[PDB]
Amino acid sequence: MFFIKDLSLNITLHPSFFGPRMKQYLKTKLLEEVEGSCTGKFGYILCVLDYDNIDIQRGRILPTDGSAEFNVKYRAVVFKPFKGEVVDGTVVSCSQHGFEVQVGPMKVFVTKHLMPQDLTFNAGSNPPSYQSSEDVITIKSRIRVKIEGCISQVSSIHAIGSIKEDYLGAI
Amino acid sequence: RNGPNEHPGAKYVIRDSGDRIDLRYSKRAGDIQLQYGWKVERHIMDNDPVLFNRQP
């Protein structure tokens, strides 16, 4: 799910950027260090809103490092997964263990135990696919996956989904 | 160039990545090219400030 969240970060600037245009460097650092990053607390931080109105607080020089630490307050859009959520995605890859969909910046793993009984793995077909009487699941296919569990690390998030429930699976 | 066996000289060269090179055993690869931001551990020279103490 996508949210607009208020976030704060501590950015450290090397003294080489302690010039008249240091504010621009901090803004550049925020894009290069926040956008495209993953955090288990706020999820995947995608885009920074109001890039021109980022609040930069006074910088504190670290005693030994000599670099200035800046507290930066910004507004950004974050994709945070949840257990029990229903999402749609594309099957990036398939294997014996299962097939995983590509939902936004995240990948949801669908285990065989989380799949319906009828579906069976078939490695003879190129590319490998799960075939059943009603539908066939292959790379690039569209699947409606329900997240059955999420593990969030400080800089990584992994989720597992199921398609056993009704109105799930191939779209 | 002087090395750790001739004062004034140096004993180690530390790169920006944290890797430290011991000038002993390092001459096999010829000279080393220093770069800005690196650290060179060199022998204490004249006029260097040091702390001088006597106990108790």
Binding site: T64 | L51, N53, Q55
Partner: protein
């Protein structure tokens, strides 16, 4: 060479706060540990790799 308590007091009198830290940390044992925000114990299993 020991940097004893009496030596620490003199540096405190001199006001060299940064030098005192340098002697006690960079010139001697220095260790980095991970602590939990809920409990202030060094019981965090960190897989740095």
């Amino acid at each position: 060479l020991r940097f004893g308590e009496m030596e620490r007091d003199c540096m405190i009198a001199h006001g060299a706060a940064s030098f005192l830290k340098e002697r006690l940390m960079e010139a001697s044992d220095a260790f980095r540990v991970h602590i939990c925000g809920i409990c202030g114990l060094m019981t965090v299993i960190a897989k740095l790799n």
